[PDB]
């Protein structure tokens, strides 16, 4: 192909953005950042269609360009129409001191969870890779594309850390092993939260995992899609749509219109 793509089509932009089909023809294309294209929510989407603080396109252009700084992502200022806010992030709306979790539904739509000045401090990080680099030093990396220097050594590659944004400090981690709580970042099963049952590795190039939860449903997904929302039953963050558990179309009806 000519070179590298550079736009994005209304029609082609993820169902996670709950986008306007009739809308236009395009859609703000996520900027190369911390999260992958599909797994992200560009700010313009976050304020216009989400919060609804903005509206028309120029509305954003003001907000992120205005010399006041109205948007914060993980304790930092952002002024990019399409910064890819990803899973388990913390976004603050300066002018109102609003704090949000970037989390998927139970139906897989990006949801905004309101946090208390309390959780707004800690953010959950999942461990990408772990190896030693320059001059005998250990480095850990998080999905959030965080690069960590001198990390606690009791941390295996597929771990989950709790991060104190305020001090850029770590605390209480927890690997994925039979008996923990987890969130699935993507898949025919995303947005779910349950107890890890067991992890059968097949090495041939793809390991799998099982899970249980509230109504004790059986879940199946690939490791790469498991995010440890916590150690031993206690979750670490407040979940959207009540608990991370979806209902039969049948259970939804009976709960709402009670059929």
Partner 1 sequence: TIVIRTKKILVNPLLSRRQLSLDVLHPDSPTASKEKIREELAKQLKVDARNVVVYGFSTQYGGGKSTGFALVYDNQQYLLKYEPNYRLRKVKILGEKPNTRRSFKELKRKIKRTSGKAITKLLSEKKGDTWASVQSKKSDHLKNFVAK
How is residue 106 written in tokens?
């139970």
Residue 5 near RNA by CB under 7 A: yes
Q: For residues 77-136, which are near partner 1 according to CB under 8 A?
A: 93, 95-96
Q: Count H helices, E strands: the chain?
A: 3, 17
User: Minimum CB separation from RNA for residue 195, in Å?
Assistant: 27
User: Minimum CB separation from RNA for residue 234, in Å?
Assistant: 29
Q: Of 41, 72, 82, 110, which one interacts with RNA (CB under 7 A)?
A: 82
User: Minimum CB separation from partner 1 for residue 46, in Å?
Assistant: 13
Burial 144-179, CB ≥16 within 10 A → b, else e: bebebeebeeebeebbbbbbeeeeeebeebbebeee
Task: Please measure the distance between the N-terminal and C-terminal CA atoms of the chain and give it in whole angstroms.
Answer: 54
User: Minimum CB separation from RNA for residue 16, in Å?
Assistant: 14
One DSSP character per residue, 20-75 reads -SSS-SB-PPPPSSSS-SSS-EEHHHIIIIII-S--SHHHHHHHTTSTT--EEETT
Give bridge partners of residue 104 from the DSSP assignment.
110
**Residue closer to RNA (CB basis): 101 or 143:** 143
In 3D, which of 144, 192, 157 has the Cα closest to residue 39?
A: 144
Residue 221 near partner 1 by CB under 8 A: no
How is residue 52 written in tokens?
């609804």
Q: How many residues bind partner 1 (CB under 8 A)?
A: 13
Residue 62 near partner 1 by CB under 8 A: yes
Residue 178 near RNA by CB under 7 A: no
Q: For residues 30-59, which are near partner 1 according to CB under 8 A?
A: 52-55, 58-59
In 3D, which of 89, 126, 141, 133 has the Cα closest to residue 110?
A: 89
User: Minimum CB separation from partner 1 for residue 85, in Å?
Assistant: 17
Three-state DSSP state, 82: coil
Which of partner 1, RNA, none interacts with 99 (beta carbon under 5 to 8 A by kind)? none
Residue 67 near RNA by CB under 7 A: yes
User: Minimum CB separation from partner 1 for residue 24, in Å?
Assistant: 17
Q: Which residues here bind RNA, judged by CB under 7 A?
A: 1-8, 10-13, 19-20, 23-29, 31-37, 44, 48, 55-59, 61-62, 65-67, 76, 79, 81-82, 128-129, 131-135, 141, 145-147, 149, 203, 205, 249
């Amino acid at each position: 192909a000519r070179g590298p793509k550079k736009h994005l089509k209304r029609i082609n932009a993820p169902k996670s953005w709950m986008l306007n089909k009739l809308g236009g023809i395009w859609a703000t294309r996520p900027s190369q950042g911390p999260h992958k294209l599909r797994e992200s929510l560009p700010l313009s989407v976050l304020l216009k269609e989400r919060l609804n603080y903005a509206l028309n396109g120029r509305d954003v252009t003001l907000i992120l360009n205005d010399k006041e700084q109205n948007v914060f992502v993980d304790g930092k200022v952002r002024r990019d129409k399409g910064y890819p806010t990803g899973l388990m992030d913390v976004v603050r709306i300066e002018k109102t001191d609003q704090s949000f979790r970037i989390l998927y539904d139970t139906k897989g739509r990006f949801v905004l969870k309101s946090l208390s000045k309390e959780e707004a401090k800690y953010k959950l990080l999942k461990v990408t890779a772990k190896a030693i680099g320059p001059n005998q030093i250990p480095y850990i990396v998080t999905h959030d594309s965080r690069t960590i220097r001198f990390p606690n050594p009791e941390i295996k590659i597929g771990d989950t850390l709790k991060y104190d944004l305020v001090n850029n400090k770590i605390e209480n981690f927890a690997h994925l092993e039979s008996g923990n709580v987890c969130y699935i970042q993507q898949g025919n099963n995303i947005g779910r939260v349950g107890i890890i049952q067991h992890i059968e590795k097949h090495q041939g190039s793809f390991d799998i995992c099982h899970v249980k939860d509230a109504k004790g449903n059986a879940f199946a997904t690939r490791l790469g899609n498991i995010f440890v929302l916590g150690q031993g039953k206690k979750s670490w963050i407040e979940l959207p749509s009540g608990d991370g558990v979806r209902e039969t179309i049948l259970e939804e009806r009976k709960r709402k219109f009670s059929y």
